[PDB]
Amino acid sequence: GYDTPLGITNPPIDELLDRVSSKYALVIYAAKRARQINDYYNQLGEGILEYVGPLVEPGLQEKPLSIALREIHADLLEHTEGE
């Protein structure tokens, strides 16, 4: 119940934290996927499709980190926590 967020505040932080144990885990859970998406874009020209690209269809020039956060909020990824 609120106005639609605009900017780097979308998706809302509370919904993201509802999935991850804590924000310290969420930052890594997002950054590693951003790195994966960036690597996929880098190897888009030619290479083995070992790193699957973005799951949710990206927008017009959306940064990889934003795509990672959106696809995390959409409940399409699963992560395992070390120790």
Binding site: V52, L55, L76, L77, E78
Partner: peptide
């Protein structure tokens, strides 16, 4: 997740 990969393409 495996479902997302299966439905990706």
């Amino acid at each position: 997740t495996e479902e997302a990969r299966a439905a990706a393409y």
